[PDB]
DNA sequence: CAGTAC
DNA sequence: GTACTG
């Protein structure tokens, strides 16, 4: 077909973007067929085309809650005093949904440990992760699974899972990254940049050094914000319930 | 880089 | 904006 419109397919695979579209463009391929068949897939690659129309498909909020509670109760049989948390569009009270993202913590601030691993490995059990796309051990004190999952059924389709543990000291601010929007962030941490502050999905921090071009030469302090309110506050804005924060 | 998360 | 792995 036209130019435009097989970049538009191809983009629409998880894990390539508009470089691999375009590069798989100049090979020829003009179809789906043609890259399942032919094309280098990484293993992410080769899973966002075996649920390519899946993907582009949209939930229904109620799904989103029945996602969530099959995530909450296989951690909750690890430790009942576990948090879990659906955010994104969903915490923000969208109709629909494009994922879900699961977001754990524990109160204790301990307990949250040991929990990531084995809460996976349950959910795989079950048959409900189908399929793994990235796993990040390495930021920090959070630990982060992206993946695809899919509710027990006839005629379910697959839906994109984050799952999310974070420790308590660190939920609020880690909260307010995965309930979003996407817009809304970099709203708050540019206007964190202008104040001197910087904030990240694991805390708000003051006195953060830039020098003269603007770069950030030095952290600060981080400030405890054990609540979504308290980010706000001293950043000295009015705070905004989820629902408004779908910009 | 490329793609991804929000 | 901030920040992760492919
Ligand atoms: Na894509």
Same mark, same amino acid.
């Given at each position: 077909?036209?130019?435009?419109?097989?970049?538009?397919?191809?983009?629409?695979?998880?894990?390539?973007?508009?470089?691999?579209?375009?590069?798989?463009?100049?090979?020829?391929?003009?179809?789906?067929?043609?890259?399942?068949?032919?094309?280098?897939?990484?293993?992410?690659?080769?899973?966002?085309?075996?649920?390519?129309?899946?993907?582009?498909?949209?939930?229904?909020?109620?799904?989103?809650?029945?996602?969530?509670?099959?995530?909450?109760?296989?951690?909750?049989?690890?430790?009942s005093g576990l948090l879990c948390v659906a955010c994104g569009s969903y915490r923000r009270g969208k109709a629909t949904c494009g994922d879900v993202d699961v977001l754990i913590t524990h109160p204790d601030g301990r307990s949250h440990r040991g929990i990531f691993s084995r809460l996976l490995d349950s959910l795989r059990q079950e048959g409900f992760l189908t399929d793994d796309l990235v796993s990040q051990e390495e930021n920090?004190?959070?630990?982060?699974?992206?993946?695809?999952?899919?509710?027990?059924?006839?005629?379910? !389709?697959?839906? %994109?899972?984050?799952?999310?543990?974070?420790?308590? +000291?660190?939920?609020?601010? *880690? /909260?307010?990254?995965?309930?979003?929007?996407?817009?809304?962030? !970099?709203?708050? %941490?540019?206007?964190?940049?202008?104040?001197?502050? +910087?904030?990240?999905?694991? *805390? /708000?921090?003051?006195?953060?050094?830039?020098?003269?071009?603007?770069?950030?030469?030095?952290?600060?302090?981080?400030?405890?914000?054990?609540?979504?309110?308290?980010?706000?506050?001293?950043?000295?804005?009015?705070?905004?319930?989820?629902?408004?924060?779908?910009?």
């Amino acid at each position: 077909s036209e130019s435009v419109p097989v970049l538009e397919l191809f983009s629409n695979i998880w894990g390539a973007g508009t470089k691999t579209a375009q590069m798989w463009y100049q090979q020829g391929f003009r179809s789906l067929e043609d890259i399942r068949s032919q094309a280098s897939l990484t293993t992410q690659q080769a899973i966002g085309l075996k649920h390519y129309s899946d993907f582009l498909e949209r939930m229904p909020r109620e799904e989103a809650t029945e996602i969530e509670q099959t995530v909450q109760k296989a951690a909750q049989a690890f430790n009942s005093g576990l948090l879990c948390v659906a955010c994104g569009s969903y915490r923000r009270g969208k109709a629909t949904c494009g994922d879900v993202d699961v977001l754990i913590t524990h109160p204790d601030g301990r307990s949250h440990r040991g929990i990531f691993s084995r809460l996976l490995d349950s959910l795989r059990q079950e048959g409900f992760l189908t399929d793994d796309l990235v796993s990040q051990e390495e930021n920090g004190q959070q630990q982060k699974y992206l993946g695809v999952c899919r509710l027990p059924g006839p005629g379910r !389709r697959h839906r %994109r899972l984050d799952i999310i543990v974070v420790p308590y +000291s660190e939920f609020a601010c *880690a /909260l307010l990254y995965f309930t979003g929007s996407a817009h809304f962030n !970099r709203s708050m %941490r540019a206007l964190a940049k202008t104040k001197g502050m +910087s904030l990240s999905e694991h *805390a /708000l921090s003051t006195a953060v050094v830039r020098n003269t071009h603007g770069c950030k030469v030095g952290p600060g302090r981080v400030l405890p914000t054990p609540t979504e309110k308290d980010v706000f506050r001293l950043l000295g804005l009015p705070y905004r319930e989820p629902a408004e924060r779908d910009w």
